[PDB]
Structure formats: structure tokens, C-alpha cells
Amino acid sequence: EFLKPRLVDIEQVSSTHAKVTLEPLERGFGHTLGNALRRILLSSMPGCAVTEVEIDGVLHEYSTKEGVQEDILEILLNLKGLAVRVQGKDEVILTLNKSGIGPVTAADITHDGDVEIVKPQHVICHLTDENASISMRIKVQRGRGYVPASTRPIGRLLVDACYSPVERIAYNVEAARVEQRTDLDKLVIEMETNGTIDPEEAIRRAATILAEQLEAFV
Amino acid sequence: GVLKIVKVYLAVKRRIQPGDKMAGRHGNKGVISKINPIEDMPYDENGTPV
């Protein structure tokens, strides 16, 4: 009958992007599973994006702070691009306090040991003069998809929520000459995450979503 | 005839929506008709959607 595919290999090339392998597959099932998984992964994957920010001396995002060359809107964009993995909670409030000349990157955030920053080199802003200090509270929360601030104190700045760990998914169906049987397919899935999702976990969640959606008529 | 004037400056932010007219530099107009999902767009062999 139909041979059951299984996750045979996880070639993690870099921190961001990885390459998983599924083998074996019958004729046609390679493309079916590849496209179904690609759509599920690009659509529905849990993420831990930033939702709200609170800089102390800032009222609205269309202003400027002395000693910081970035506008507050550019700071909010840089925070929106921040990749962070939270494990034991849904929402968490990271704290950033930085003074003195230099780049305020993501490594200056208070560790919050259950919350891991995956790209410490991510520059958030720049401090120009020594007597300048910034202090902000960043609300990193778990979610799915893309939730703009239009859908959901006068000192709280709301950023657009983009809880999608994956950035690019591709799949390739090749011939797996194995098990002394020809005309069998192997699906190689190259995914480009931001580092906050393990590729095996991503594939497992994608298959779980398909299995749950198929329960409507089986 | 006027006693005092108070001027308030709102800062709206217009993102994009079906209806907004985008164009190019060669007379190619066009209003956005749909904001397609990321996984519905055509993609090349490397997986990058257009």
C-alpha cells in the first residue's frame, strides 16, 4: 500500500534557515504534501512578536528623543523586526536600559531568563552623546499571523504584530532510490525561519494542523 | 471678531488597501484590487513570492 513518509533528516545549515527531508513518498504525494505543508507553514505558525513599547520620555511615535539619532518611529520599526523566543509564558515585558554613546542593540535587554533573544546583534537604536539614556518596556507576546494595530495611558506606543517565525518556504521533490524500489519520491523542505522555531517542530505543527482540519469528514 | 484659535495636528497613518492607486514611472496606473495572502502569490524555485 501507501508507504508512510517520516522525518528522516534535519540539515540545519545556518541558525535562521534549515533543510528537512521526508522519505519515502508515493507518486504525486510529494507535491501534495509539499504544497500543503508550505501553505500551512507560511500561514499558521506561532510567533513571539512585539506588540507594545513604552519609552519613558516619549508621548507619541512621531517625536524625537535627545541624544538618539533614530526617530521614535524608526525605533518602533527596529523593535518590530526584533526576533525573540518566549517559552513559559504567553506575554512578557522585557526591559531595556542603556546609556552612553553607542549602538543600543538587542543584547542590552534584561535577560528575563525564560525569554531568549536569538539575534543579539540586532541594532535597535543609536545613542549619540554620553549623557543620554533610554529606558523602554517592550511587550513581547505570543500570537499567530499578522495583526495590525488598526484591528486590536497616552505614553504607550503600539507596533504592528507580525507573529510569523518563517520567512521563506521552498520544497523540492526528488527521486529517492532506496529500499530496492524505484519511482519513489523524497520531499526536501528548505525553510527560512528567523531562528525562533525549530524546523522539526515547524513540520510537526504543520502536519498537526492538516490532521486537525481533516477531522471534519473522517 | 475671533477671541482665540486652537490648532490641533493629527497624524494619521495610511497603510494600503484595495482601492489605492499605485503607478510606475512609465504611465502604468492601477488601483489595488486585492491584498493577497503571502502563500497564495506565485513563487519561483527558491520559494520567494512576487
Swiss-Prot record, chain A:
Reaction catalysis annotation: RNA(n) + a ribonucleoside 5'-triphosphate = RNA(n+1) + diphosphate
Underlying gene: rpoA
Biological processes annotated in GO: DNA-templated transcription
Organism the protein comes from: Escherichia coli O157:H7
Keywords, comma-separated and alphabetical: DNA-directed RNA polymerase, Nucleotidyltransferase, Transcription, Transferase
UniProt function note: DNA-dependent RNA polymerase catalyzes the transcription of DNA into RNA using the four ribonucleoside triphosphates as substrates.
Family according to the record: Belongs to the RNA polymerase alpha chain family.
EC number(s) reported in the record: 2.7.7.6
Lineage: Bacteria, Pseudomonadati, Pseudomonadota, Gammaproteobacteria, Enterobacterales
GO terms under cellular component: cytoplasm; DNA-directed RNA polymerase complex
Subunit and interaction comment: Homodimer. The RNAP catalytic core consists of 2 alpha, 1 beta, 1 beta' and 1 omega subunit. When a sigma factor is associated with the core the holoenzyme is formed, which can initiate transcription.
Highest rank taxon of the organism: Bacteria
Gene Ontology molecular functions: DNA binding; DNA-directed RNA polymerase activity; protein dimerization activity
Residues of the full protein shown: 7 to 232 of 329
Name the UniProt record assigns to this protein: DNA-directed RNA polymerase subunit alpha
Keyword Glycosyltransferase: no
Residue runs in coiled coils: none
Entry domain remark: The N-terminal domain is essential for RNAP assembly and basal transcription, whereas the C-terminal domain is involved in interaction with transcriptional regulators and with upstream promoter elements.
Region (Alpha N-terminal domain (alpha-NTD)): 1-218
From Swiss-Prot, chain B:
Family, similarity comment: Belongs to the RNA polymerase beta chain family.
Assembly and binders: The RNAP catalytic core consists of 2 alpha, 1 beta, 1 beta' and 1 omega subunit. When a sigma factor is associated with the core the holoenzyme is formed, which can initiate transcription.
Protein name: DNA-directed RNA polymerase subunit beta
Main function: DNA-dependent RNA polymerase catalyzes the transcription of DNA into RNA using the four ribonucleoside triphosphates as substrates.
Entire protein: shown range: 1045 to 1094 of 1342
